[PDB]
Design a protein around this ligand. Structure first.
Ligand code: HEM
Ligand code: HEM
Ligand SMILES: *[C@@H]1O[C@H](CO[C@H]2O[C@@H](C)[C@@H](O)[C@@H](O)[C@@H]2O)[C@@H](O[C@@H]2O[C@H](CO)[C@@H](O)[C@H](O)[C@H]2NC(C)=O)[C@H](O)[C@H]1NC(C)=O
Ligand SMILES: *[C@H]1O[C@H](CO)[C@@H](O[C@H]2O[C@H](CO)[C@@H](O)[C@H](O)[C@@H]2O)[C@H](O)[C@@H]1O
Ligand SMILES: *[C@@H]1O[C@H](CO)[C@@H](O)[C@H](O)[C@H]1NC(C)=O
Ligand SMILES: *[C@H]1O[C@H](CO)[C@@H](O)[C@H](O)[C@@H]1O
Ligand SMILES: *[C@H]1O[C@H](CO)[C@@H](O)[C@H](O)[C@@H]1O
Ligand SMILES: *[C@H]1O[C@H](CO)[C@@H](O)[C@H](O)[C@@H]1O
Ligand SMILES: *[C@H]1O[C@H](CO)[C@@H](O)[C@H](O)[C@@H]1O
Ligand SMILES: *[C@H]1O[C@H](CO)[C@@H](O)[C@H](O)[C@@H]1O
Ligand SMILES: [Ca+2]
Ligand SMILES: [Ca+2]
Ligand SMILES: [Ca+2]
Ligand SMILES: [Ca+2]
Lengths: 344, 344
């Protein structure tokens, strides 16, 4: 169908209005389509907005939250005070102007920006975008977003309540930490990545969390973190535990050297996550507006410079960690990703 | 020496003025230290400024140019009209204000910007900076910067006249095409990279130019270009010929899988190029102002997705092209690097 603008075409008229939002954010939020601080922040926003849903609280007569309803923006003055949501007050502040200019809901904007932000990362899957998330009525309660100091059992339970995500699917979701940094965990350094390739959607996160830890990247012993294997890299205690837990270890290892599996799983689970609190069959598929992802321009998984197969703590009992190629050069260090400055 | 900053430190007081220049271009020219369009442009400037020097014209009583003297900016009205300098008028226009703002010489600024620009690219060597290039007195004549349709013999003569670079050293200087795109060779499309990793100072350029060429990326038969092996990648005819010439083929192949050789050679030759027309001995070493290069966060050289050792056109007779690992995913395609918008 021809859009009213005379310029675009869409298989559903409701999709028309997203073309202008795409051009605006590619240019002004992601600074020319980068997989940078803003793209990583857009993906974290999808998770903090979406997982705040609890059939278990609902069943007890309590509001368990609306899932993917943009409540983190509409009710940011409540929701960004929660400890799991640290730093999102500034992310809301960067995203607000775009929502206002385009007259779209905060919920649909979050899912759209998260999908477009991921597509800018080499190795990303083709991302989907389902449309139809009315404004939130109420703020989600606290206690719904997982913390890096929670036990594996506590995280697995929350995930299963929120969305019926088992432990296999939870491992797939954590693929998101392959394009991510920590700005607010270590008070002395902001922008410490979780893998040595925060600008690439790959399996380095799955390789590097399996290495033995040798030091804290900044301030020593922060709760929710453990020693990481590389200077400049942060390791969260949960990611450390998932890589070594008997229920999840082999799934964790399965992404090592399997970019195809990584893409397929994440493409699926991201659609599941972004539509929590809604009926997908009642939403409009505007996936056609999301651009083709940046192509892979990297080889197979590797051991960072200075590390060998001997540095691997094997945890998958049925399958031994593969013997990967070591990167060239001097012992690896990871460069920081400085966060955006306050607003515009 | 304490810098009359009340802050910084340098071994030579003349180096303190470059700290402020650093900060300004890192944020405003390179848009937060990236290895993007402007960083690539700054490196191209070094070459186009420095190589316009000719002992052979001088000995005939003609001005052969001043080498690294900033003449491409002082005399932009003349130099940027030469065919080999296509697109450099927009680059001069972008660089001029910083020069005016900090009151440094144009030649010193060009070398400083190119060193800083390259250090932003993962895989780069530690870059040097020698200070002391007085303003140009005259515009270099034309006929001094190589063209992609020139023969190997002609390019080699030109380089040997200019700075005494043999065929070996010429192969090293061409490592710069590992972090570069063509904005103006195909009139149909700008930003076509020469390797599939324009944001990494690596050996993919040396791998990729050796693959059999299969299609033109835009318009067919453009002068000074040949068929490249991947959609979205341009292959220059000089680059094609160097990979296959008996004089240069083995030196070209020596960089495949030798990140260390790649770095050491380029560190050296870049210093050699940037001081053409001056006595390095009378220059101040201000290398301590240049940031440590972004670390390697990539594995060994690889064949792009869809290519194998079978696709390589062997040119080095003494050493066969190594069997590299093939990248994951579907047949590789190369994403464009859009040029900066024209401030005129
Ligand atoms: C399930 C257990 C999880 C826990 C304990 C956890 C923990 C964290 C922590 C503590 C940070 C740093 C935040 C800051 O410093 O302000 C982080 C950031 C990040 N997380 Fe998670 N996370 C979980 C799962 C997820 C999931 C499933 C995704 C989304 C699909 C997600 C996407 C992100 C990304 C993209 C960032 C980086 C933000 C940016 O770079 O600014 N995380 N997470
Ligand atoms: C000596 C034979 C060489 C030839 C024939 C040549 C040819 C070219 C051509 C035709 C382009 C595209 C320009 C345009 O489309 O505007 C280009 C870009 C580039 N060249 Fe060379 N070049 C040579 C050597 C070098 C060397 C020695 C260096 C620096 C040390 C260099 C640095 C670059 C860079 C970094 C760019 C990309 C510019 C940006 O992306 O905008 N070139 N080269
Ligand atoms: C990475 O590079 C150095 C540089 O050496 C040579 O690389 C060859 C492929 C060759 O074509 C030639 O042009 C170049 O000089 C490799 O070998 C080194 O040889 C030099 C000379 O004395 C030394 O600088 C190095 O220390 C020496 N290495 C050793 C082990 O002696 C080096 O071997 C190479 N690595 C690989 C992967 O081959
Ligand atoms: C590296 O090893 C390979 C074996 O995988 C050899 O390559 C053979 O196969 C190539 C296609 O993969 C082909 O182009 C080549 O000529 C060989 O027949 C290669 O010689 C190296 O020894
Ligand atoms: C990669 O994952 C696929 C599933 O998507 C699986 O069949 C295959 O065994 C895995 N291969 C590797 C290289 O581990
Ligand atoms: C080599 O040194 C680097 C830089 O200190 C570390 O990041 C790495 O673990 C190894 O010790
Ligand atoms: C390790 O060192 C690198 C360079 O080796 C830095 O970029 C990084 O911040 C880390 O401290
Ligand atoms: C596979 O396909 C791509 C096109 O997507 C080419 O770049 C490549 O050369 C191979 O044929
Ligand atoms: C081919 O190149 C190799 C590098 O792999 C050299 O060692 C050899 O002598 C020949 O020139
Ligand atoms: C091959 O495909 C990529 C994206 O998949 C493009 O960006 C490129 O220009 C080429 O057509
Ligand atoms: Ca919500
Ligand atoms: Ca990564
Ligand atoms: Ca000059
Ligand atoms: Ca490259």
């Amino acid at each position: 169908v021809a859009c009213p603008d005379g310029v675009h075409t869409a298989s559903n008229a409701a999709c028309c209005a997203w073309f202008p939002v795409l051009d605006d954010i590619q240019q002004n939020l992601f600074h020319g389509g980068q997989c940078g601080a803003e793209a990583h922040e857009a993906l974290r926003m999808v998770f903090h907005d979406s997982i705040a849903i609890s059939p278990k609280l609902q069943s007890q007569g309590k509001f368990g939250g609306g899932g993917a309803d943009g409540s983190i923006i509409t009710f940011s003055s409540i929701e960004t005070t929660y400890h799991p949501n640290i730093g999102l007050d500034e992310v809301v502040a960067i995203q607000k102007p775009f929502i206002a200019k385009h007259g779209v809901t905060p919920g649909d904007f979050i899912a759209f920006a998260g999908a477009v932000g991921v597509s800018n990362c080499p190795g990303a899957p083709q991302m989907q975008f389902f449309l139809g998330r009315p404004e939130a009525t109420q703020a989600a309660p606290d206690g719904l977003v997982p913390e890096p100091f929670h036990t594996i059992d506590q995280v697995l339970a929350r995930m299963l309540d929120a969305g019926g995500f088992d432990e296999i699917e939870t491992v797939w979701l954590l693929s998101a930490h392959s394009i991510a940094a920590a700005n607010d965990v270590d008070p002395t350094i902001s922008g410490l990545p979780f893998d040595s390739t925060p600008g690439q959607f790959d399996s380095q996160f799955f390789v590097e969390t399996q290495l033995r830890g040798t030091a804290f990247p900044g301030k020593t012993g922060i709760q929710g973190t453990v020693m990481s294997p590389l200077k400049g890299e942060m390791r969260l205690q949960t990611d450390h535990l998932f890589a070594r837990d008997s229920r999840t270890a082999c799934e964790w290892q399965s992404f090592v050297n399997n970019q195809t599996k990584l893409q397929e799983d994440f493409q699926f689970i991201f659609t599941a996550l972004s539509t929590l609190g809604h009926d997908m069959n009642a939403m409009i598929d505007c996936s056609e507006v999301i651009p083709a992802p940046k192509p892979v321009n990297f080889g197979p998984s590797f051991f960072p410079a200075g590390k060998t197969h001997a540095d691997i703590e094997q945890a998958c009992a049925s399958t031994p960690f593969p013997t990967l190629i070591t990167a060239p050069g001097p012992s690896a260090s990871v460069a920081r990703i400085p966060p955006p400055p306050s607003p515009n």
